[PDB]
Amino acid sequence: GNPLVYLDVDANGKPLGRVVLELKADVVPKTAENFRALCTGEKGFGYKGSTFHRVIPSFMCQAGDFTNHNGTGGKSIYGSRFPDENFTLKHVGPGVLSMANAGPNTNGSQFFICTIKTDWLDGKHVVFGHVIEGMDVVKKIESFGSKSGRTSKKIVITDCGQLS
Ligand SMILES: CSc1ccccc1[C@H]1CCCN1C(=O)CNC(=O)NCc1ccc2c(c1)[C@H]1C[C@@H](N2)[C@H](O)CO1
């Protein structure tokens, strides 16, 4: 079946709660596996201790640059980049989990959680899961963003892992 993973998120060193994500290994196994392993940290690196670096209200919350912490970095469990697996899943609404990229076939570790339907990203960003619970925590994160993407508090994934 599909993995269930979690992100525990702080704002300025104080807990916001837990986001639980289903990873659609049934549709995008390579993309799901990358995220799963970055949550557990089992390859020796991952999301623990990294930030939501770009948060745009009424759009999405972006994270996963655990190398440069500024939106330029991150890496996959396979290497520095990996191909777009498929575009079967669509950006249908709030809670969609999708890969950030620098154009075709540049998936690394950066990802975003949508807070609206972002259907204009269909065919460009690989969707690979969704929020199961903790959408209220995603809304808390969203509230510290701005149209520029700059956050008013430092938003950190303090812990993350796999539930099943
Ligand atoms: C910025 S609002 C926005 C507006 C329109 C479309 C998309 C976006 C936003 C919101 C949703 C996702 N997203 C974007 O994806 C923007 N694009 C980046 O932020 N790109 C940085 C980025 C991503 C992945 C990777 C690297 C660098 C590095 C490391 C490794 N992966 C590879 O090797 C390539 O270089």
UniProtKB/Swiss-Prot annotation:
The answer, when asked if Mitochondrion is one of the entry's keywords, is yes
Q: Which residues carry this modification: N6-succinyllysine?
A: 24, 43, 132, 147
Provide the top EC class: isomerase
Self-association and partners: Associates with the mitochondrial membrane ATP synthase F(1)F(0) ATP synthase; the association is increased by inorganic phosphate (Pi) and decreased by cyclosporin A (CsA). Interacts with ATP5F1B; ATP5PD and ATP5PO. Interacts with SLC25A3; the interaction is impaired by CsA. Interacts with BCL2; the interaction is impaired by CsA. Interacts with TP53; the association implicates preferentially tetrameric TP53, is induced by oxidative stress and is impaired by CsA. Interacts with C1QBP. Interacts with MCUR1.
Statement: the UniProt record of this protein carries the keyword Metal-binding: no
**Region of the whole protein represented:** 44 to 207 of 207
The protein depicted here goes by the name Peptidyl-prolyl cis-trans isomerase F, mitochondrial
Main localisation: mitochondrion
Q: Which organism is it from?
A: Homo sapiens (Human)
Residues bearing N6-acetyllysine? 24, 124
Annotated GO CC locations: cytoplasm; membrane; mitochondrial matrix; mitochondrial permeability transition pore complex; mitochondrion
**Modifications after synthesis and translation:** Acetylated at Lys-124; deacetylated at Lys-124 by SIRT3.
> Which Enzyme Commission numbers does its entry carry?
5.2.1.8
Question: Can you state which reaction this protein catalyses?
Answer: [protein]-peptidylproline (omega=180) = [protein]-peptidylproline (omega=0)
